[PDB]
């Protein structure tokens, strides 16, 4: 029935511009007030703007004079023109339709389009093997430091090693992402069997393998 689909999201530099579009179908579009609501990386929900059935517009202060909400009833689409983009504007942007023919209560939401505002350069991660230091099981690891943008793909032994794995959500520090992963196995499994960290970063077009070498005295 009711379908909403956002588009036009992407990566931009601070001070940049974007125009989101929201394609609606499965209802009489002119009847309803529409809105844009964003979800920040901290997963807070922030109402951004609303447009009435008669083109009256409402904004939250932070985007006033920078964003413009509009509708095109002939084409069933809602727009959000974004200008002078800021770091804070980074969010998933949802378009919504009023529940009833009355107000802007967020009755129906699209699946969202992602907007990222960052001054970071595209950066391949540095991938470091984490070998155990001075039993029954042993925990190995992989550090994927300082990359942009998201995402990376990390597997262990090309996907063969899947259980006992924790891969921690990427986190931002100094405009770059860092991620890590642990893999826990039987002590008899390793280092008898080889274990390798595979990291792909499809944006710097890099693919890296890192074998976890056991620590020990083939020291000089």
């Amino acid at each position: 029935e009711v379908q909403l689909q956002e588009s036009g999201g992407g990566l931009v530099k601070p001070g940049g511009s974007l125009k989101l579009s929201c394609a609606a179908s499965g209802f009489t579009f002119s009847t309803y007030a529409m809105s844009w609501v964003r979800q920040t990386p901290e997963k807070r929900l922030e109402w951004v703007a609303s447009i009435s059935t008669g083109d009256n517009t409402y904004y939250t202060d932070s985007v006033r004079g920078r964003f413009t909400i509009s509708r095109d009833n002939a084409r069933n689409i809602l727009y959000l023109q974004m200008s002078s983009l800021r770091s804070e504007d980074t969010a998933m942007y949802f378009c919504t339709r009023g529940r009833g023919d009355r107000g802007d209560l967020f009755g129906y939401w699209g699946q969202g389009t992602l907007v990222t505002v960052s001054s970071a350069k595209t950066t391949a991660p540095s991938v470091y093997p984490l070998a155990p230091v001075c039993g029954s099981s042993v925990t190995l690891g992989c550090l994927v430091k300082g990359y942009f943008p998201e995402p990376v793909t990390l597997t262990w032994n090309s996907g063969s090693l899947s259980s006992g794995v924790h891969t921690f959500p990427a986190v931002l520090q100094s405009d770059l992402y860092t991620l890590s992963s642990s893999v826990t196995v039987t002590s008899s499994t390793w280092p008898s069997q080889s274990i390798t960290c595979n990291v792909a970063h499809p944006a710097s077009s890099t693919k890296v393998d890192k074998k976890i070498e056991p620590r020990g005295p083939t020291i000089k």
């Binding site: 929900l45 967020f106 540095s126 984490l130 155990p132 550090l143 990427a170 860092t178 890590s180």
Partner: protein, 217 residues
């Protein structure tokens, strides 16, 4: 602003339990003209948009199961689930539409109770490979613990360091309902080599004393 506050922010639950979520309003949402509360609840499952659950504080949206029940008035609102189902284990947001700006509460996340488990702690020196580039990250994994509340301190030669620590926390594990955490201390290579003892210490309610993992450079 009109400020919406949800309590608590997270709640440990058992399937089949009755649970209750609070949403508080910094100003009343009760409109005298029609005695309606301009308050809505949303559910947001992982990867999905929020979906409207309740509106006018107590009106279920169509196709919303009877176990969901909203109540309250003025500034104090409640979302109740009669018998929680596994698919209800997620985030719920309240929202006022009494005035502009439209404002949301910070959300309440429901999670699964499971019985306390101690972290398995592992410390890792910087890789020789990172050292070559003049960097030195020290990594500490704290894996498979419950409840999720945990504290990590880095101590270097017996003294505590806070700058340059990067922490990350998993979501509750779907298989064992436990939590894991990663802590990374990044130093300059030079500063890493001015010290010997590196220590990751985890404070968790499963022990009256820290779980300590250390190495000497």
């Amino acid at each position: 602003d009109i400020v919406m506050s949800q309590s608590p922010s997270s709640l440990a639950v058992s399937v089949g339990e009755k649970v209750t979520m609070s949403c508080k309003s910094s100003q009343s949402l009760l409109y005298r003209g029609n005695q309606m509360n301009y308050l809505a609840w949303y559910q947001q499952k992982p990867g999905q948009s929020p979906k409207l659950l309740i509106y006018w504080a107590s009106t279920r949206e169509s196709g919303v199961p009877d176990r969901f029940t909203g109540s309250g008035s003025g500034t104090e609102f409640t979302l109740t689930i009669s018998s929680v189902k596994a698919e209800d284990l997620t985030v719920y947001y309240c929202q006022q539409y009494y005035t502009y700006p439209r404002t949301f509460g910070g959300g309440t996340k429901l999670e699964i109770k499971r019985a306390d488990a101690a972290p398995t702690v592992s410390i890792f020196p910087p890789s020789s490979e990172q050292l070559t580039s003049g960097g030195a990250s020290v990594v500490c994994f704290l894996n498979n613990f419950y409840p999720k509340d945990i504290n990590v301190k880095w101590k270097i030669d017996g003294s505590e360091r806070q700058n340059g620590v990067l922490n990350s926390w998993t979501d509750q594990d779907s298989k064992d309902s436990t939590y894991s955490m990663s802590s990374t201390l990044t130093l300059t290579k030079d500063e890493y080599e001015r010290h010997n003892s590196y220590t990751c210490e985890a404070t968790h309610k499963t022990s009256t004393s820290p779980i300590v993992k250390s190495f000497n450079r």
